[PDB]
Amino acid sequence: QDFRTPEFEEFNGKPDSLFFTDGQRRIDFILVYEDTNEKQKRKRQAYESNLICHGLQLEATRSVSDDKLVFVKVHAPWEVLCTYAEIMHIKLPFYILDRDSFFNPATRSRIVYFILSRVKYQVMNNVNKFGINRLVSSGIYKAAFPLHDCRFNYESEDISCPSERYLLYREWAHPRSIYKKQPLDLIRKYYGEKIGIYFAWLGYYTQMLLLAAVVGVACFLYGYLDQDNCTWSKEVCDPDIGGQILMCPQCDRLCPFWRLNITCESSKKLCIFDSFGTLIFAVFMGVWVTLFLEFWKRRQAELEYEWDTVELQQEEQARPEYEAQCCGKCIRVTLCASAVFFWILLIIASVIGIIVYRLSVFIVFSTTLPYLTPQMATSITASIISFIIIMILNTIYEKVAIMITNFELPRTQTDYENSLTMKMFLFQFVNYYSSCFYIAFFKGKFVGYPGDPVYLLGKYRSEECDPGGCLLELTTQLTIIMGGKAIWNNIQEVLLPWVMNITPRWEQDYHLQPMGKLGLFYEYLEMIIQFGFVTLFVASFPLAPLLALVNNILEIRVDAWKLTTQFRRMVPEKAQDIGAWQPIMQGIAILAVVTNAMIIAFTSDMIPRLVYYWSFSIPPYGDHTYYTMDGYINNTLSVFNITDFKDKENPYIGLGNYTLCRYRDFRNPPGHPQEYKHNIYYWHVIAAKLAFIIVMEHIIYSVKFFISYAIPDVSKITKSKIKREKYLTQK
Amino acid sequence: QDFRTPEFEEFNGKPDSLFFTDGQRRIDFILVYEDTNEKQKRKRQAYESNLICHGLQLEATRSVSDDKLVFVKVHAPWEVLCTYAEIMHIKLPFYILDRDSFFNPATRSRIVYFILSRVKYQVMNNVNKFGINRLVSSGIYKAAFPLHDCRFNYESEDISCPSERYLLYREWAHPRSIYKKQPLDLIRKYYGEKIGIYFAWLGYYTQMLLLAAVVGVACFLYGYLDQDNCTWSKEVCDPDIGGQILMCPQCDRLCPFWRLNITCESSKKLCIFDSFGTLIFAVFMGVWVTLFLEFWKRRQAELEYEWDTVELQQEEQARPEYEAQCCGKCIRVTLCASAVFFWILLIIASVIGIIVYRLSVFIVFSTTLPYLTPQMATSITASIISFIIIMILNTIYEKVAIMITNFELPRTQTDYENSLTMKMFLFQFVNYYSSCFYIAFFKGKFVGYPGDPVYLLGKYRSEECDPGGCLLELTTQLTIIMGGKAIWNNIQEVLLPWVMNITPRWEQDYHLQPMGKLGLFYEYLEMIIQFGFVTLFVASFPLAPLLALVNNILEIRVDAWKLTTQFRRMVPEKAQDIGAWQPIMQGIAILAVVTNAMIIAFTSDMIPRLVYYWSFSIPPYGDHTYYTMDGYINNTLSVFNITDFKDKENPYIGLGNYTLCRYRDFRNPPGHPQEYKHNIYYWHVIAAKLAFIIVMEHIIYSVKFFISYAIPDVSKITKSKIKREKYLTQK
Ligand SMILES: CCCCCCCCCC(=O)OC[C@@H](COP(=O)(O)OCC[N+](C)(C)C)OC(=O)CCCCCCCCC
Numbered sequence A, B: 001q002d003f004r005t006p007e008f009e010e011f012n013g014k015p016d017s018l019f020f021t022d023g024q025r026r027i028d029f030i031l032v033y034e035d036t037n038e039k040q041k042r043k044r045q046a047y048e049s050n051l052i053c054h055g056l057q058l059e060a061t062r063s064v065s066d067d068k069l070v071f072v073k074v075h076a077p078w079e080v081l082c083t084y085a086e087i088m089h090i091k092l093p094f095y096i097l098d099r100d101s102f103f104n105p106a107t108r109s110r111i112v113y114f115i116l117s118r119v120k121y122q123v124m125n126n127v128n129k130f131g132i133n134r135l136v137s138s139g140i141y142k143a144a145f146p147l148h149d150c151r152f153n154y155e156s157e158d159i160s161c162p163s164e165r166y167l168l169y170r171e172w173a174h175p176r177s178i179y180k181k182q183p184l185d186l187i188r189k190y191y192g193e194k195i196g197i198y199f200a201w202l203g204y205y206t207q208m209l210l211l212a213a214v215v216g217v218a219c220f221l222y223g224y225l226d227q228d229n230c231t232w233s234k235e236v237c238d239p240d241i242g243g244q245i246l247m248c249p250q251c252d253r254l255c256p257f258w259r260l261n262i263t264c265e266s267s268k269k270l271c272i273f274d275s276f277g278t279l280i281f282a283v284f285m286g287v288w289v290t291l292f293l294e295f296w297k298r299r300q301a302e303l304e305y306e307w308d309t310v311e312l313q314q315e316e317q318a319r320p321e322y323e324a325q326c327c328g329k330c331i332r333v334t335l336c337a338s339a340v341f342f343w344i345l346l347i348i349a350s351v352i353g354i355i356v357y358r359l360s361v362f363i364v365f366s367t368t369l370p371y372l373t374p375q376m377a378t379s380i381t382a383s384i385i386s387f388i389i390i391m392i393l394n395t396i397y398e399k400v401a402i403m404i405t406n407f408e409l410p411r412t413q414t415d416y417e418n419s420l421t422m423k424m425f426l427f428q429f430v431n432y433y434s435s436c437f438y439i440a441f442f443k444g445k446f447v448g449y450p451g452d453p454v455y456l457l458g459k460y461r462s463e464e465c466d467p468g469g470c471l472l473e474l475t476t477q478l479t480i481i482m483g484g485k486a487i488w489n490n491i492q493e494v495l496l497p498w499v500m501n502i503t504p505r506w507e508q509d510y511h512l513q514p515m516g517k518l519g520l521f522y523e524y525l526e527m528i529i530q531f532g533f534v535t536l537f538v539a540s541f542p543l544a545p546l547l548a549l550v551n552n553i554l555e556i557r558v559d560a561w562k563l564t565t566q567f568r569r570m571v572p573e574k575a576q577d578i579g580a581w582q583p584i585m586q587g588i589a590i591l592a593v594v595t596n597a598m599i600i601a602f603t604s605d606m607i608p609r610l611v612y613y614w615s616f617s618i619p620p621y622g623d624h625t626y627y628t629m630d631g632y633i634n635n636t637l638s639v640f641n642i643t644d645f646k647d648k649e650n651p652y653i654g655l656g657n658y659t660l661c662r663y664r665d666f667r668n669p670p671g672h673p674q675e676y677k678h679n680i681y682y683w684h685v686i687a688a689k690l691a692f693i694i695v696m697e698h699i700i701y702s703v704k705f706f707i708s709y710a711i712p713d714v715s716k717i718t719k720s721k722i723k724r725e726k727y728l729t730q731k
């Protein structure tokens, strides 16, 4: 009730003062309020009473535009600065040249934020009810933000203070400054080591993506230049050889007998994407991943020394919702785990809907066709509809997961962000990569011969793949999803405000958007999901690091322009690493080695070509003299006489005027004793596929272990600097 | 020259005083010397001068038995105790009840050892030439040991001091106290947290080996009880079926045509060791390994809290050899790496000598035979000769590796122990497990059909395996090596001093053996090598954890009796973990998952039995009705008509009066078009083997990752104790 703030001067002489009316002390925080309201007014006055009794100097100012709002300028004198600096253990370099400039205003802002989080506001209905975040959650204060130095598109009128926001906008956040390196010490000094380590991680990720994109475009150029040497494509759309294959139908009855002449252009793309260049690129990408992780740990330790992020934390004060709300926690985490499991089953049901749509619209496209084949058109529209489902479901799960982790009770903001990180990454992982996993590993891998086809649930045959392989469909789906997400983000964040185009400093900072309690987390998530698209399916097509590099180069500058201009100034924090995203990245790495090996083995369909080249064109099995690839299509596809194993009994007879069809499997001809069991060539191919998985997995994992053992976790320059600062501190 | 020690009292009133002649101050160290000698005498007197000038109180005593030796009792007063306790940051619990008993004499001994390592002994030929270890390396002091409390087999005569060595011998080191648990706080308090963490690791290793041995003897009892249900053994030594197989010869000419009747007893053991019980045990042993590592990290963090081992280290003073001796370091480490690579190539040449011996003595045993077959006798004598070579080579490499790492120059004792650990573990690893790796993975796996056998170097055919499999020979080799090492250590350390069966305290402690600069390191190495025998080849036979448990139970007590009675009292040190042995153990774990999977797949020969049971006894391939195992031997072994592919041209004709032989491979009969290429059954078996490797490796590694994620790295009780001590220290 007593000890009100010093009353309003409201002079508004300079538009950007960043100082009190006496001009000798600097504003650190701004607290905004308005004026059943009498007890809240007593509450605010008691908070300011305990605030002045703690030692912070205060001032009021009524707003010149809207007289309901009152702005409270908060300054910390030097004494409480030294006491709470010794309390929270801030590392310092020494310079007593200016007491005001000894602490940069980021450090002053986090000191005043610690003081505002410690102050009790006298409400003892529940005893010891304290906090500034409780006041803005209760609504008696609207915000407790610090101030920006100046406008971004102008110069600070005060020549005393540095116009650091203008310098950061001119050198880092302008889109016509996209070529310059990020000034990382300015970003750290102005925004804290939680934002600075994010932008350092993003710049380093951009450099490693540049390396991977250079090697990927080299391998893709090798494939595109060596697309003429490929023999099986030239054989499959030779009209004499592939035109007379007469492939067996794919659906039950409503699909006609089709020839293998039609897939030529498809195979003319497919040899660019399943060649030896993609194998060399995936074997490179494993080593690139372990280089990425090891040099990230080196850069993280270098930032840990240089930005002194290991300073001692506080006791991690609980959330105001957890203080205001408080076997039960066990059934709560069980209920939220069952909810996220139910949502994962919903996205699996969406994938099954994509399968059923693929079958039905393939029948429709086949009957409406009389360039692009019906299979490629079916795959393209399926990928489009699928990606639209991905966008709808990830927005809906964003809202639902916010509500789910708000339903259960975490203790602090760290545990809240960790639980939200876990469930959000789990559904974003499954939601983005489940369709690609089904295309790569479970599409056409379980269908039988046309005499006894397999039925998944009855009346729906499992979808058959093209005789070249399902790698082109996986490439189409992956490119559609990744490019659609990149174009969606570059229309939402970049194109929208670009196509859209006196008062004091605190009033200008009020008319902005706060960053939120999560902050950079969502942005982090995008890159992590993008990381999986770089890493899990890199053998699908090698041009994914180039698209990721373009999206990352634009993402750095759109995050910079969002953070400098759009968002309010946040309280600077300390962070030694990115958080849970580094264990998530290591898990994605360890899984994606296996995923790349299984994409080259099962999906890419180059191991049958290698086995036919080395062991099946030889006089024990083939009529050729030496190792050669011609005659691959005629000796690969199995022959089927029309003898249904089975009650309709007419899948192919009603439209068939030819007695013999061919199909993509490795089984015996019908004249054989074991007429439709698996051939010796099938088991040769399967043994070679699993041997390739074992050899590539063990070689890549041993190389990654040896590289992680050979590269030190911290650089020699950083060890020398640590030794030098220890030796100078000891004296 | 000045400030000599206070002169000799030599009263020798009590045999165990552990106090000075005044009786108020406790002896902490004993420095022994004797008396071109004049400069060394001046050196010793200058060392004692700087010692008394630092503040330590000294006393001399001439020896009553041998008058050349002089014993110097070293006491630290309370002032220098507090100053150097604040210097080296010793954690304390508070009790000023006795100033002498505030620091236990282990802490007093390590304080006085720090002081003796800091003191400069005035020799400024090379400037600042300092250390106590330099004096005992130079020979002017013989030793600088602390004192034991009392005799082990008697009670201390002084009722003031606790007879802690007698209590430790009575409760921990006596072989008639083998059933009691180790008193770990007494071991830690008396011997430092370098010995205490070793014995805690050994006791915990014994408990986990007890668990693994219980499950292993359960699986072995399942195999031994279910040895009658096994069908292929009953078929192979049925005289009607296996007696008429007439297997094809193994060597070139001097091996006769042998029948498969002879292997019955061998197969009667082999079904005990390749059954489903060993597969279940290896799948269990992966989870047991990750449980071992996770609960070891939990116990290590619990000891880290309880024994405060994380206290701040000093600057890691260099070795006296490195101070006395000092592109060059690069060529030195290159030369020592080439030396250890040359020695590894020598042990590979010894393995090749074992191969050549196996072939030649199999010919000799086959010609001298007219129970045990010649193959089993050949394997047994080969394992005996091999194990003798292992013992000779590991002793010789122990001496050679000491000389090699003494040739190159490490800076400190930590780097010296790490380099010796690396090269010693590398050769002990290769030396112990190379013969077992060759038996499991490269024995009989590369031999062709008897028409075109393979020659490794010319005139020597690669050795063929028995049709049951090489798992019995691997079991024999593993049991011989492990039991021979255990019996060798229990004859050398245990049986030898057991079959072998006034003066002051410092004279009794002098007539002992010092522990050495390496200490427990060699003992550590044995358990680590034994750990590989528990882990890498556990699917060979499941009774290896039982033998390891017996050897570990005896090893705890022989290390206790060595350390309490035989060895001199060492200076207590601090250690947070075991050292390099924990990364070495994690590497052995990660390798041994793969090694167990490849032992079950390639060596165990149960995947051909499963494939014949499920897919080759069926009317597509077999004459049987349902899944059954009878007819495995007749339908498994390939048939060979005598048609040599090839200049001797008579390997089998000279002793052969039968036109048809059978051999252990999966190839076609001679009437086939592809007469001797690999069968469809071969590629089915190979694909099933590699699928088993992939499935078991990914399942075991995912289970190990999920268990390492599910179990916390530190216990909840230890977190509560850390919270409580932090909350009490904050007040
Ligand atoms: C861990 C993260 C991603 C896991 C993805 C699982 C991949 C599953 C692969 C699969 O379904 O293959 C099953 C069969 C069929 O072999 P394919 O060569 O696909 O036969 C169909 C191709 N063809 C129509 C031209 C004849 O192949 C086999 O019989 C070999 C089975 C080996 C499976 C190993 C999976 C690892 C499980 C932990």
Ligand SMILES: CCCCCCCCCC(=O)OC[C@@H](COP(=O)(O)OCC[N+](C)(C)C)OC(=O)CCCCCCCCC
Residues within 6 Å of the ligand: A691, A694, A695, A698, A699, B441, B442, B444, B445, B446, B594, B595, B598, B602, B664, B665, B666, B686
């Ligand atoms: C990493 C630590 C330990 C590594 C140990 C390496 C193991 C090598 C296994 C091996 O040599 O097998 C080669 C062939 C032969 O298959 P087997 O079934 O052994 O044929 C001989 C058996 N038979 C006489 C009854 C007919 O089998 C194959 O063709 C499949 C080759 C797959 C090799 C995977 C090794 C991983 C290398 C990094």
